[PDB]
Design a binder for this molecule. Structure first.
Ligand SMILES: CCCC(=O)OC[C@H](COP(=O)(O)O[C@@H]1[C@H](O)[C@H](O)[C@@H](OP(=O)(O)O)[C@H](OP(=O)(O)O)[C@H]1O)OC(=O)CCC
Ligand SMILES: CCCC(=O)OC[C@H](COP(=O)(O)O[C@@H]1[C@H](O)[C@H](O)[C@@H](OP(=O)(O)O)[C@H](OP(=O)(O)O)[C@H]1O)OC(=O)CCC
Lengths: 1042, 241
């Protein structure tokens, strides 16, 4: 299970036993001999002929033997007394302290170096060139940031950093060991019935290995223990097997198990996973894999000191960058004026289009006023308006999270570029004065007029359409009301609402609510996409005080406030205050784009703060990371919660770094997500050094495929390969691609590369199939070798989200009792269309299965050869055994598949493993995003079981539509579709948080809306079952009832 | 009157409705479990209303509609359903209307293909432009360094030439290897710039033909959901797509 390439041992019974930034500007990968101009401190260039791969140690060394031959020598002193400097790619003069870097690894721009003595004495604080290399933009580029919000985020966040660095060093060394090597642990300790059941009433055989002296010598101790006994107990009874001699009294045996006992801790054989705290043994994901797969766990007895040896200190430093009370917003006595002045740089065919006019609105997720335009005046050629816009909404009634949203349009109506501006700045001031906003180009999806789903801020581009605005002036700067000055408003409203007698819509001591209006626990239960009616909104608003009882109703209630009504909003604040904390699977909608208010989102965090575990968090990390775009300012409560988690658990730290860095190139977030990374990298301790090295390889790997794809394709694989190899022999590469942690799962060390096992795959996109040796001493016992694929040219983000949506479905079913076995192989987007794809060993494409066997005269596929091939690889009950898996997984990758409406499952994106497990690869585009052109209704069946697959499901005989094994199946599918249907909210909420991404199959809630048809949410389960069966019955051309 | 009703699109659940409400403006109306109730009005962002309240003098589904097609200011703080008669070029074949569908649908497909070709070139060109902006400055920095150098060359040179004869020569030499090289680099930074502003140009020619070929890709789009709709009002629609 990423542990064993998901490989079931079937006989095993437990009972019966910057881009284009090659090495040099333009160049790519730099030529093998290269001349370097070395500018001296005596003002003389001397040109060294240097090998591509030489270290600045050899170069410094050669240069000062060679100046010896140019005029003015005595005017220089010993090398020892100088450092190399040059202009890098990112155009910043880098001092080169590490003098062991290679001439090819520096990213130089032009091939020249300069000699200086290094002033800046804190040679220490300039190790943070690291921090810059780790993020791919250089820290000093932040000290160049004028804007005061960013420069404030940089200082304020340091709180969190010292919090983490503190909360770690708490019970050193154990607490720092708990930091680096956090127990990998399933969520329920309660096992599920079908798993417990492979255990002869709950007992695992486990093999503990031990190291005494050489020690290239080993010792097995096969314990058989209660399934739920904490690592300590296991180490206890382990050392018991070890010692018991004929010369040891029983009493003095027990004594020795007391002393020795806890000087050791349990490590997983073959990777850097340790079992460092109490958990029932079956809770660690490893054991519970090993059980699932018919495996004997192998643990290794670890000297606890020898571990505390392997980590040393992270050693934090606080970094180098270490008008009165204003006027209450609620005093401003007028509507909102907004003046659109001119616009600069629209590019259109003056003949091809009628006119253009600026379209604006004020929004809060969905607007609070009568949206408005502005006369179609000066079209096209140099376009000015001087209009003020009269928005009907009083200024005291603007929400905190309220926002101007504009766009330039063409008439015939059509949007050209859009922009959204935050009507309040972070310190709480109501925007005034000039703003030159900088618009975004309208995307794929949206063929609407405005864009409130979009991001708030100016697009950074000298060459985009700049539109220039003026917000009203109020002779004092204006701040949004104090958190108290609102709780005084509520109390008023409430004492006011208690003294009327006519009734209207908000037709609200003791209220008449009795029973019948238990339509409230009804609304409650409906999913998010499913809209709230007018009445329902008023209805809810009118029983707001009741809702507290059904607290998970909030996500609706909120939508029911009129957000342009301080009275309503001022009260909705006081409820949020003492609203019951709620379960994460539903506090997480509160962070999607429909809830932009700070108090709301603050609560959503307080909820997480409370419930979400360190494991549920790594399960939903993307959703969390991604959702950040919808936070209004830089320093917000979510950012702060996440960061603290990142710095407390280095395995969340890992995937927090990458997820952020993946989008590093994406203009909408580059700013936000750089600063946050500068934060992580400064406080995560030693790990930063480990990340530099992953980062160091992924670059060499980018710049290698980048040469293969451009000028180098057209030559036969054979030629291309004997280049790829030529190139990884390079010293600089062997070095950079060999001693690091797998970015796919950092517990997996990558040792020496093994080239004969490396190769370019067949795909157009030239993937690199790479293979590393496991340099664990117990390599053997897990996987001696270790391979991953590196693909450059596919937005992986999608494959990644599906694979995350498969992993969730699985846990759901299983972690409930219901055993379908999906194999969501691992996948990591590490850049702009550059990702790592995990390799399932022993899989095959249906195509090959059919191609490995089946007659001579190549005259047409034998529909039985899948079965056959399996029935070769598995004789025995090892047969009955492999079919159950094939049946159990086939049913899974079917429901999931129908639900997420992924790409067609034609005959070579379905794979079969030797133990009989089938799974998908290459999910095209999910959510049937090929109804973009047509797809009206369809609700297509992507996986459709041909005769082929059916034969295998019904062990053999003809007429498979009608056996029992088939019913068994069917009855699996029903159970599995209905199970997902019970959790739909989570699944919508999941895709909802994704809208934030640049993924073009996720543009707007209507994109998500598919799921709500697939899952038949508008109906009763009873009906859904039938809709589902029918749907199967139909692509399957009949026979799917009784 | 209720079946025909013009805006009573029938069974069309929440999603057929919303994807027939996307892109019409204000004024737009149209009517749609029984643990919930009966029919829904869906105006326009989307406003669902379930008489609506106590003053139900009914008298019909339709007697309700023409007082609020005459409105809804007075209970809470435009048919757009026009029976696909308008255009759909009155081609009354059930099949000429159908094959036509395909004819605009390949055309829509054709444009999305030229469109996305363009969306990506822009995004590429943007990034080549910025990469050309911090090159232009990686050049400017390079020269700053060389200037700084070749001056410190003269600071120390005209300070060791109180001299005797050899040296004199072979100092001026490398000093003059240096100032040609300064020119040589400068040769490069105008050149890059001339390609920069060459690209800065053709960048516009993309935003031009994007916002030139967006008008189409909504109209051509629109009339399709117009034609496509006259089929499902009377009549498998897979083949023409
Ligand atoms: C006879 C020589 C044989 C040979 O092996 O030659 C191999 C290498 C040179 O590498 P290349 O891949 O041929 O060069 C790239 C392509 O030709 C591409 O067409 C071009 O585009 P454009 O210039 O048209 O834009 C690239 O420009 P940039 O944008 O990267 O500057 C260019 O760099 O020299 C050596 O390493 C050994 C010689 C010391
Ligand atoms: C810059 C030019 C873009 C381009 O044309 O590039 C051609 C290829 C790279 O593949 P792609 O186009 O990026 O990818 C396309 C999608 O996978 C799509 O799903 C599929 O449609 P379907 O038939 O599966 O539904 C397309 O089929 P055709 O488009 O081949 O018919 C497929 O090509 O490079 C080469 O090797 C060129 C060799 C001449």
């Amino acid at each position: 299970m990423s542990y064993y390439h998901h490989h079931h041992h079937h006989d095993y019974d437990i009972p019966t036993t910057r881009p284009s930034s090659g090495e040099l500007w333009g160049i790519h990968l730099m030529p093998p001999r290269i001349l370097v101009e070395c500018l001296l401190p005596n003002g003389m260039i001397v040109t060294l002929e240097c090998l591509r791969e030489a270290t600045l140690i050899t170069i410094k060394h050669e240069l000062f033997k060679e100046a010896r031959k140019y005029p003015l020598h005595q005017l220089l002193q010993d090398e020892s007394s100088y450092i190399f400097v040059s202009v890098t790619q990112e155009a910043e003069r880098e001092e080169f302290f590490d003098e062991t870097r290679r001439l090819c690894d520096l990213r130089l721009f032009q091939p020249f170096l300069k000699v200086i003595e290094p002033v800046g004495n804190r040679e220490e604080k300039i190790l943070n060139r690291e921090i810059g290399f780790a993020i791919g933009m250089p820290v000093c580029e932040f000290d160049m940031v004028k804007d005061p919000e960013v420069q404030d985020f940089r200082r304020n966040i340091l709180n969190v950093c010292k919090e983490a660095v503190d909360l770690r060093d708490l019970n050193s060394p154990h607490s720092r060991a708990m930091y680096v090597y956090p127990p990998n642990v399933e969520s329920s300790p309660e096992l599920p019935k079908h798993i417990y059941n492979k255990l002869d009433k709950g007992q695992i055989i486990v093999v503990i290995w031990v190291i005494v002296s050489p020690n290239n010598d080993k010792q097995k101790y096969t314990l058989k223990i209660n399934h739920d006994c904490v690592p300590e107990q296991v180490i206890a009874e382990a050392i018991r097997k070890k010692t018991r001699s004929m010369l040891l009294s029983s009493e003095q045996l027990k004594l020795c198990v007391l002393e020795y006992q806890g000087k050791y801790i349990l490590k997983v054989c073959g990777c850097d996973e340790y079992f460092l705290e109490k958990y029932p043994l079956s809770q660690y994901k490893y054991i519970r894999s090993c059980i699932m797969l018919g495996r004997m766990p192998n643990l290794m007895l670890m000297a606890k000191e020898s571990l505390y040896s392997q980590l040393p200190m992270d050693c934090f430093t606080m970094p180098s960058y270490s008008e009165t009370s204003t006027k209450s917003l609620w005093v401003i006595n007028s509507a909102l004026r907004i003046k659109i002045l001119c616009a600069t740089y629209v590019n259109v065919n003056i003949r091809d289009i009628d006119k253009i006019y600026v379209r604006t609105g004020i929004y809060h997720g969905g607007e609070p006023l009568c949206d408005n335009v502005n006369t179609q005046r000066v079209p096209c050629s140099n376009p000015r308006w001087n209009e003020w816009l009269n928005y009907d909404i009083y200024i005291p009634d603007l929400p905190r999270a309220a926002r101007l949203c504009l766009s330039i349009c063409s008439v015939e109506h059509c949007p050209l570029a859009w922009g959204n501006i935050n009507l309040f700045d972070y310190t709480d001031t109501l925007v005034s004065g000039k703003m030159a906003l900088n618009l975004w180009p309208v995307p794929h999806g949206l063929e609407d007029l405005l864009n409130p789903i979009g991001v708030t801020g100016s697009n950074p581009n000298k060459e985009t359409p700049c539109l220039e605005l003026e917000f009203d002036w109020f002779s004092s700067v204006v701040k949004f009301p104090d958190m108290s000055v609102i709780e005084e408003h509520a109390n008023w409203s409430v004492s006011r609402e208690a003294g009327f007698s006519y009734s209207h819509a908000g037709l609200s001591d003791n209220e008449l609510r009795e029973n019948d209006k238990e339509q409230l626990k009804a609304i409650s239960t409906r999913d998010p996409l499913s809209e709230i009616t007018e009445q329902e909104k008023d209805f809810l608003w009118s029983h707001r005080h009741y809702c507290v009882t059904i607290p998970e109703i909030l996500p609706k209630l909120l939508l029911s406030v009129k957000w342009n009504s301080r009275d309503e909003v001022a009260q909705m604040y006081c409820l949020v205050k003492d609203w019951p904390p709620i379960k994460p699977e539903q506090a997480m909608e509160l962070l999607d784009c429909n809830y932009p208010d700070p108090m709301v989102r603050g609560f959503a965090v307080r909820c997480l703060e409370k419930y979400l575990t360190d494991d549920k968090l790594s399960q939903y990390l993307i959703q969390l990371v991604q959702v950040l775009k919808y936070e209004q300012y830089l320093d917000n409560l979510l950012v702060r919660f996440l960061l603290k988690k990142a710095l407390t658990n280095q395995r969340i730290g890992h995937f927090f770094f990458w997820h952020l860095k993946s989008e590093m190139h994406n203009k909408t977030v580059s700013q936000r997500f750089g600063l946050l990374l500068e934060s992580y990298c400064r406080a995560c301790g030693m790990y930063l050094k480990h990340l530099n090295r992953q980062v160091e390889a992924m670059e060499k790997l980018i710049n290698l495929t980048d040469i293969l794809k451009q000028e180098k394709k057209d030559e036969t694989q054979k030629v291309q390969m004997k280049f790829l190899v030529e190139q990884m022999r390079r010293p600089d590469f062997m070095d950079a691609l060999q001693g690091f942690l797998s970015p796919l799962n950092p517990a997996h060390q990558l040792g020496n590369l093994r080239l004969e096992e490396c190769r370019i795959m067949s795909s157009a996109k030239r993937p690199l199939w790479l293979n590393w040796e496991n340099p664990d001493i117990m390599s053997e016992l897990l996987f001696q070798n270790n391979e991953i694929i590196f693909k450059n040219g596919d937005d992986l983000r999608q494959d990644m989200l599906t694979l995350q949506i498969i992993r969730i479905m699985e846990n759901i079913w299983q972690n409930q009792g219901l055993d379908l076995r999906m194999l969501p192989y691992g996948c990591l987007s590490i850049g702009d269309c550059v990702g790592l794809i995990e390799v399932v060993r022993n899989s095959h494409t249906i195509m090959q299965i059919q191609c490995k066997g089946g007659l001579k005269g190549a005259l047409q596929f034998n529909s039985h050869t899948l079965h056959q091939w399996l029935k070769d690889k598995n004789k025995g009950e090892i047969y009955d055994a492999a079919i159950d898996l094939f049946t159990r997984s086939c049913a899974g990758y079917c429901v999931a598949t129908f639900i997420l409406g992924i790409g067609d499952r034609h005959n070579s994106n379905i794979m079969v493993k030797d133990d009989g497990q089938l799974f998908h690869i290459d999910f095209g585009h999910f959510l049937d995003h090929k109804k973009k052109k047509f797809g009206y209704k369809r609700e297509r069946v992507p996986f459709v079981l041909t005769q082929d697959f059916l034969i295998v499901i019904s062990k053999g005989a003809q007429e498979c539509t009608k056996t029992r094994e088939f019913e068994r199946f069917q009855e699996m599918c029903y159970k599995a579709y209905l199970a997902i249907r019970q959790h739909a909210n989570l699944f919508i909420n999941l895709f909802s948080m994704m809208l934030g991404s640049g993924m073009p199959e996720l543009q707007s809630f209507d994109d998500i809306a598919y799921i709500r048809k697939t899952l038949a949410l508008d109906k009763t389960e009873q009906e859904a079952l039938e809709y589902f069966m029918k749907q199967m019955n139909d692509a399957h051309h009949g026979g799917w009832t009784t | 009157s209720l079946q025909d009703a013009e805006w009573y699109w029938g069974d069309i659940s929440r999603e057929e409705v919303n994807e027939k409400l996307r892109d019409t403006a204000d004024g737009t109306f149209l009517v749609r479990t029984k643990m919930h109730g009966d029919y829904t009005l869906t105006l326009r962002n989307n406003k669902l209303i379930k008489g609506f309240s106590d003053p139900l003098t009914f008298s019909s589904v339709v007697e309700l509609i023409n007082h609020y097609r005459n409105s809804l200011a007075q209970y809470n703080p435009y048919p757009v359903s026009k029976y696909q008669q308008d255009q759909v070029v009155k081609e009354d074949n059930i099949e000429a209307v159908g094959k036509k569908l395909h004819e605009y649908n390949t055309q829509f497909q054709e444009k999305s293909r030229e469109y996305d070709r363009l969306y990506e070139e822009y995004t590429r060109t943007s990034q080549e432009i910025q990469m050309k902006r911090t090159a232009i400055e990686a050049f400017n920095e390079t020269i700053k360094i060389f200037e700084e150098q070749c001056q410190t060359q003269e600071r120390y040179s005209k300070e060791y030439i109180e001299k005797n004869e050899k040296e004199i020569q072979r100092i001026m030499h490398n000093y003059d290897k240096l100032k040609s090289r300064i020119s040589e680099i400068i040769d490069s930074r105008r050149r890059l710039e001339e390609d920069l502003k060459k690209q800065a140009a053709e960048y516009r020619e993309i935003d031009k033909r994007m916002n030139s070929i967006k008008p189409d890709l909504i109209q051509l789009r629109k009339t399709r959901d117009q034609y496509l709709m006259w089929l499902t009002q009377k009549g498998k629609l897979n083949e023409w797509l």
